Design a protein around this ligand. Structure first.
Ligand SMILES: Nc1nc2c(ncn2[C@@H]2O[C@H](COP(=O)(O)OP(=O)(O)OP(O)(O)=S)[C@@H](O)[C@H]2O)c(=O)[nH]1
Ligand SMILES: Nc1nc2c(ncn2[C@@H]2O[C@H](COP(=O)(O)OP(=O)(O)OP(O)(O)=S)[C@@H](O)[C@H]2O)c(=O)[nH]1
Ligand SMILES: [Mg+2]
Ligand SMILES: [Mg+2]
Lengths: 169, 86, 86, 169
């Protein structure tokens, strides 16, 4: 069985943990629980293939930022999450992408851009602005809501497909 | 002083571990309370739970409930490598 | 600076690991030479061997032969605990 | 399957590694190879029972002495080795026994006293002196030679039996 090593990154409170728990455990609770570092594993079927997902759920808090230079070395693909009601989290995205490329010494790291909290009405990041950024990077962009679960499968499975293609060279 | 510790539960729920902060003055009941909060066991009696350090696959070390955890745990730092033929 | 690293080989010979010293100026060829000496592979060509850091069961990290090992390895320190019902 | 966690302790050069390699790998070479910390595992039959031996081979060198307070917490039984041509290594034995008891907070830790290099003619430790010490401790004493392999099985298997009895209370 193939195993895909996924890492979820992004700013405080954007929904990294909520997305991950929805994918793995199929539930959502509005609760305060800042992450240091959590790890999950689940066997799934993607595009008819059985595989193993290993997901590292990382800290948004800058107090733990020194950990990045380490966990970035062993991730195969990265879900870069911002929240559509949090402009600063969208501005952070390019810093995560630049660090991932630096640590891996590669201009071609599997990545998917995720705009989360799409259930909210108080939007401050334009969808077309996110689509343009992702196009300039050459990566997919998916709008998600951990609260309604819209787009959760698509985001993680699209990352797996990107990794699969990178591995196939 | 402080350090990060990885906490796992035996529920086969897809979680491998969740990390929490450990401090040099933490005694075992406090760490148990923090671990249960982290794994959503806060409504359950802490006295029913114990804190066990995993040293290797076959080696474990139960922290007694009266102990300062920094002092009672094995704090040895190990890095593992394979010498592999190409 | 210095630190201890555990070296395993894939020979199913009953050895789990053997520890060697690693220093901050060691580059990968030196560590390979030291690991092979330790596992009685000194007569074999070092170029046929590679140094691989084990991060978790599914995560490994090959140290490139040109690298300072201190700098290239994941040096993160983790301690593992189980929250267990009595 | 029951697993027994054995730890081999004693001064520089007494033969801790040579004894261990003979037990696990059945060979002996006169070679210089100071130990930091080595670990071995082997399934054996003792007294008709199949079991797993996990053996920690420790450093005689005092430069690594700070490690003792850690590995002593998780050993189930201890092979305390001196060499019969090394009086200082015999004088060290009581310090290892006192430290093991301290770290484990127990006056009753499974232990076996091993007098190694019994093949040598240049003896400086009297066998009766070792027998009296072990009697005063209440533990078995076994003379071994990793070079001829005399007493290797007996030393490790006697430790396993001691652990088995301690576990049975
Ligand atoms: N409305 C809405 N709320 C969400 C959504 N995703 C997460 N949340 C909520 O946002 C808050 C923070 O989400 P959470 O998953 O903990 O963020 P995080 O990215 O993991 O935060 P950190 O660990 O880096 S500090 C929580 O209250 C959570 O319930 C979503 O899609 N819609
Ligand atoms: N003659 C004889 N030589 C032995 C015997 N056991 C070990 N030796 C030799 O003694 C020397 C040291 O033995 P060794 O096993 O490395 O000691 P150690 O106790 O593991 O030493 P350290 O790692 O704490 S520095 C080696 O030369 C070894 O071959 C024995 O029973 N008889
Ligand atoms: Mg989180
Ligand atoms: Mg040795």
């Amino acid at each position: 069985m193939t195993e895909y090593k996924l890492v979820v990154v992004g700013a405080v409170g954007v929904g990294k943990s909520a997305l991950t728990i929805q994918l793995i455990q199929n539930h959502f609770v509005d609760e305060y629980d800042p992450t240091i570092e959590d790890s999950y594993r689940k066997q799934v079927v993607i595009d008819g293939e059985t595989c193993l997902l290993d997901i590292l759920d990382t800290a948004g808090q800058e107090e733990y930022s020194a950990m990045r230079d380490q966990y970035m070395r062993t991730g195969e693909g990265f879900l870069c999450v911002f929240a559509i009601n949090n402009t600063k989290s969208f501005e952070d995205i390019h810093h995560y992408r630049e660090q991932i490329k630096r640590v891996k010494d590669s201009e071609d790291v599997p990545m998917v851009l995720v705009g989360n909290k799409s259930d909210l009405p108080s939007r401050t990041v334009d969808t077309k602005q996110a689509q343009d950024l992702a196009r300039s990077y050459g990566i997919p962009f998916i709008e998600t809501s951990a609260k309604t679960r819209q787009g959760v499968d698509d985001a993680f499975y699209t990352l797996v497909r990107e990794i699969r293609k990178h591995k196939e060279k | 002083d402080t350090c990060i510790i990885r906490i796992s539960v035996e529920d086969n729920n897809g979680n491998m571990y969740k990390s929490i902060m450990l401090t040099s003055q933490d005694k075992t009941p406090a760490v148990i309370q923090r671990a249960m909060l982290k794994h959503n066991l806060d409504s359950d009696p802490a006295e029913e739970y114990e804190l066990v350090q995993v040293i290797s696959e076959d080696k474990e070390l139960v922290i007694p409930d009266s102990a300062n955890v920094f002092y009672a745990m094995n704090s040895q730092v190990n890095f593992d490598f394979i010498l592999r033929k190409k």
